[PDB]
């Protein structure tokens, strides 16, 4: 690719998450952006059904 000036600096993403944990149903949507080659990213997740979550969000972190 010659040099970093020819790589996409950032890329956006969108997410839909649906599931059931200990019998509790929920659905989320999310939106974010990251830097593909620097390996960094951030996103915002909104619970749209089943909120407020009756369990720690942390168990969903690696699935977002």
């Amino acid at each position: 690719h010659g040099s970093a000036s020819f790589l996409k600096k950032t890329m956006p993403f969108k997410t839909t998450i649906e599931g059931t944990v200990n019998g509790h149903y929920f659905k989320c949507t999310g939106k974010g952006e990251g830097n593909p080659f620097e390996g960094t990213q951030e996103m915002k997740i909104e619970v749209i059904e089943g909120g407020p979550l009756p369990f720690a969000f942390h168990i969903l972190s690696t699935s977002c």
Binding site: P12, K14, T15, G39, Q41, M43, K44, G51, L53, A56
Partner: protein, 167 residues
């Protein structure tokens, strides 16, 4: 969200190689106090935007545990081992919740990553490590709205080098 990894030392990037088609992953995470969290995900690229579709089934979390009590604290950083099996990639990692009050609650991730390209079109990476730093930075609401940051690095074990030229 494995498209966002910094690979060093020339380690091939299985995720970026999989586009424009994308890839899937599948995982079961086993918690030391009996919980299971299973997930399937599809990653696609829609023009310039990545699109994730995630299915989750979790069960057996103890009612008196940090997860169901919503008293989990924060994740420690973690390190996944990633290697080829059956012409796809396997990952495993140990993660640890640092709970309020100091105790860690650990879990073990078992993952398979599947390119939508055939393995014949891919340069497969050798055995390596992928560090993940995950921070749930803003709890905007409850319950209801979360901001999450991640930094990830694919690397070899450089701190304790081989005396034989092994990675």
């Amino acid at each position: 969200s494995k498209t966002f990894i910094k690979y060093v030392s020339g380690i091939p990037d299985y995720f970026k190689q999989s586009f424009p088609e994308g890839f899937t992953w599948e995982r079961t995470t086993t918690y030391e106090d009996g919980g299971f969290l299973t997930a399937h995900q599809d990653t696609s690229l829609d023009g310039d935007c990545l699109v994730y579709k995630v299915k989750i089934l979790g069960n057996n979390f103890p009612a008196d545990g940090p997860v169901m009590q919503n008293k989990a604290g924060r994740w420690e950083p973690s390190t996944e081992i990633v290697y080829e099996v059956d012409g796809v990639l396997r990952g495993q990692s140990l993660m640890a919740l640092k709970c309020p009050g100091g105790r860690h609650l650990t879990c073990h991730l078992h993952t398979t990553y599947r390119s939508k390209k055939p393995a014949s079109a891919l340069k497969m990476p050798g055995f390596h490590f992928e560090d993940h730093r995950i921070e749930i930075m803003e709890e905007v609401e409850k319950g209801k709205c979360y901001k999450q940051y991640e930094a990830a690095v694919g690397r070899y074990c450089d701190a304790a080098p081989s005396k034989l030229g092994h990675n």
